[PDB]
Design a protein around this ligand. Sequence first.
Ligand SMILES: C[C@H](CCC(=O)NCCC[N+](C)(C)CCCS(=O)(=O)[O-])[C@H]1CC[C@H]2[C@@H]3[C@H](O)C[C@@H]4C[C@H](O)CC[C@]4(C)[C@H]3C[C@H](O)[C@]12C
Ligand SMILES: C[C@H](CCC(=O)NCCC[N+](C)(C)CCCS(=O)(=O)[O-])[C@H]1CC[C@H]2[C@@H]3[C@H](O)C[C@@H]4C[C@H](O)CC[C@]4(C)[C@H]3C[C@H](O)[C@]12C
Ligand SMILES: Nc1ncnc2c1ncn2[C@@H]1O[C@H](CSCC[C@H](N)C(=O)O)[C@@H](O)[C@H]1O
Ligand SMILES: O=C(O)[C@@H]1CSCN1
Ligand code: SF4
Ligand code: FES
Ligand SMILES: [Cl-]
Ligand SMILES: [Cl-]
Ligand SMILES: [S]
Length: 347
Amino acid sequence: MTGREILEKLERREFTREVLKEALSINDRGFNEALFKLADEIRRKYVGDEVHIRAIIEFSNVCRKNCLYCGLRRDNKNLKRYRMTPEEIVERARLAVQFGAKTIVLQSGEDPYXMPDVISDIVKEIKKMGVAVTLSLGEWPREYYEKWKEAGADRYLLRHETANPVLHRKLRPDTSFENRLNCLLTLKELGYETGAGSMVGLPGQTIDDLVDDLLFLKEHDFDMVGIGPFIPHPDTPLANEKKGDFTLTLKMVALTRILLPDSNIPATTAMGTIVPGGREITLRCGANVIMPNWTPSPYRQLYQLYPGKICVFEKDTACIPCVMKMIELLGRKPGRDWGGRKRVFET
Ligand SMILES: C[C@H](CCC(=O)NCCC[N+](C)(C)CCCS(=O)(=O)[O-])[C@H]1CC[C@H]2[C@@H]3[C@H](O)C[C@@H]4C[C@H](O)CC[C@]4(C)[C@H]3C[C@H](O)[C@]12C
Ligand SMILES: C[C@H](CCC(=O)NCCC[N+](C)(C)CCCS(=O)(=O)[O-])[C@H]1CC[C@H]2[C@@H]3[C@H](O)C[C@@H]4C[C@H](O)CC[C@]4(C)[C@H]3C[C@H](O)[C@]12C
Ligand SMILES: Nc1ncnc2c1ncn2[C@@H]1O[C@H](CSCC[C@H](N)C(=O)O)[C@@H](O)[C@H]1O
Ligand SMILES: O=C(O)[C@@H]1CSCN1
Ligand code: SF4
Ligand code: FES
Ligand SMILES: [Cl-]
Ligand SMILES: [Cl-]
Ligand SMILES: [S]
């Protein structure tokens, strides 16, 4: 099909494997621009002009897992490890709420020390502040997820990474796609707003794999979808692999918006790392969420899933103001409420 025909099928919601594969394979500038315009318009119509701010506190870079892509993998001895105290985390969340954040995201490596009860205690304290709490702590037993939901957690981010089970097991040798999916299903069952998503440009990942990632996301109707490029880290086995392409990754975000029109979709920091101004582009191609870094010094610079991350050299409190300026210069509005998913039931 020509680009014009692919676009027409996307506009009529004929989301076949073939339409998605062709959308990802056509490299014509005119087609891509039209795809991005469509996704921007769908975003505007379904989720409006509010860009929701999720302040992220990366509270520990200790991890028990050994994912091949990740700078926090347990085999990386060239990394100073750190843990914020529970008091530090609560007070740092309070400062973000003082700065206007309406969601606090707590993210870490899979660090056993906190699990499950110290997390529960932190969540209960933050919930007193009248904001949404999102956890992004990795894979844990059902019982831990249940405890955190009873403590008041609202949302959980657990990117599926890659929907190719073979590639998933190779890159994540401690676990499996089946396990990852079972965690996501358990989180949904428990009443979390649940986020999935994937990296683009992983070694060995194909276009057909990206199509499978889109169809997976569409299948499960996730509340949130986090997408970014793979960025190689020098202290990992994938150090010499190519970085994911920004344009391809942006097309994944655009297609995700077209597929899941009422979902919450961040403009990720990895997008702003590989291209200067990449978050702002992504916010104009389907995204409607931003996650300003709220990790304090001196830890911020130690939380390096990938290198060269933007924002690391800035003062503690810079990123909330910075994203508020971004949202204004984009002609957008800050979120007025917690920014939970507002489902638009259709046919
Ligand atoms: C800003 C640049 C360069 C534009 C440019 O420089 N040309 C425009 C100003 C031309 N003027 C109208 C002021 C004067 C014309 C008379 S003149 O005689 O001066 O040329 C234009 C050229 C292509 C545009 C992107 C694509 O669409 C894809 C996508 C659609 C989304 O929905 C919004 C996001 C995104 C990324 C777009 C953003 C932006 O919009 C771009 C980069
Ligand atoms: C934290 C300190 C000290 C006072 C304090 O502890 N303030 C708690 C405010 C709590 N809220 C955010 C929920 C108020 C919402 C009011 S609002 O009327 O916006 O709905 C206060 C004093 C001045 C405040 C900044 C300025 O103002 C400019 C700007 C306005 C944006 O908007 C949000 C960002 C920013 C940078 C502000 C952040 C923060 O706030 C500051 C630093
Ligand atoms: N090298 C790299 N490049 C780009 N993104 C990466 C990366 N290493 C990790 N990430 C991404 O960062 C996300 C958060 S990792 C932190 C939370 C948790 N340990 C977890 O694994 O879910 C991952 O889901 C992955 O998609
Ligand atoms: O892009 C990033 O850096 C982070 C990783 S998971 C949330 N976004
Ligand atoms: S991706 Fe998450 S689980 Fe895997 S090594 Fe990094 S921090 Fe640990
Ligand atoms: S969002 Fe971090 S300094 Fe701009
Ligand atoms: Cl969130
Ligand atoms: Cl994300
Ligand atoms: S900023």
